[PDB]
């Protein structure tokens, strides 16, 4: 898909057995790789590759506030019941910066 007007279909099974078979065999987490060559299809895409690339660049250096904000940006849903585990900073004597 490319989100330029694609119309997609959505079906609702009417049987518990069909629902369980769909969840098990056709689960999104259970079909992360194509059967053609085993390569993973469900992966990062545009605006996720560039964002992670700019994030992991050597020029990046974040203070405590920005790093804490970026880390907390993911603490939603099932991640609301886990500790943050703020990593120790790399540079600390001149300025405390998190890469």
């Amino acid at each position: 898909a490319d989100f330029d007007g694609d119309e997609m279909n959505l079906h609702l099974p009417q049987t518990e057995e069909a629902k369980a078979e769909a969840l098990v065999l056709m689960g999104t987490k259970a079909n992360l790789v194509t059967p053609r060559n085993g390569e993973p299809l469900i992966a990062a895409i545009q605006d996720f590759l560039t964002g992670a690339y700019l994030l992991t660049l050597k020029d990046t250096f974040f203070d405590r506030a920005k790093a804490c904000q970026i880390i907390a940006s993911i603490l939603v849903g099932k991640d609301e019941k886990i500790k943050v585990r703020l990593p120790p900073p790399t540079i600390l004597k001149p300025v405390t910066l998190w890469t």
């Binding site: 895409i45 545009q46 605006d47 996720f48 590759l49 560039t50 992670a52 690339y53 700019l54």
Partner: protein, 149 residues
């Protein structure tokens, strides 16, 4: 054909050298270059086409055929095998394309479109046949693949 290959080689030399020069002169933090390095979208070829120089327009893996008599367009001389008269695009997308270069680019785009249009139906029929033939096989419990019979 030897002359055609040599002219294509020279045009490709111009294209790749202009692309290398553009990539070397470009500074970091450039959004097209940044998106090309990480591979999210685009590549160095698209950057070279949109900045430095568009490549040779190739139809069916060859230069633009002579639609008219002994020439592609009446704007060029007869029996003229010059690069600009056969599909080469000296200007880039930034500087703007001449009417002949734009026409050749539209020809290439329409060729790609009709190729994809034929490919869709051809592969649909091939997939239908292959699935109708292969849908009977299944992996048994004795590690032996057996048919329905």
């Amino acid at each position: 054909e030897t002359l055609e290959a040599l002219i294509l080689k020279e045009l490709s030399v111009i294209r790749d050298h202009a692309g290398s020069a553009c990539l070397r002169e470009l500074d970091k933090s450039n959004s097209p270059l940044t998106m090309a390095l990480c591979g999210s979208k685009g590549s160095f070829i698209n950057i070279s086409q949109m900045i430095a120089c568009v490549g040779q327009q190739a139809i069916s893996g060859s230069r633009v055929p002579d639609g008219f008599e002994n020439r592609s367009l009446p704007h060029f001389e007869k029996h003229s095998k010059l690069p600009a008269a056969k599909g080469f695009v000296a200007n880039s997308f930034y500087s703007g394309l001449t009417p002949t270069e734009f026409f050749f680019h539209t020809m290439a785009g329409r060729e790609g479109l009709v190729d994809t249009a034929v490919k869709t139906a051809e592969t649909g029929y091939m997939q239908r046949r292959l699935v109708k033939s292969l849908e009977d096989l299944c992996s048994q419990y004795d590690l032996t693949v057996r048919s329905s019979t």
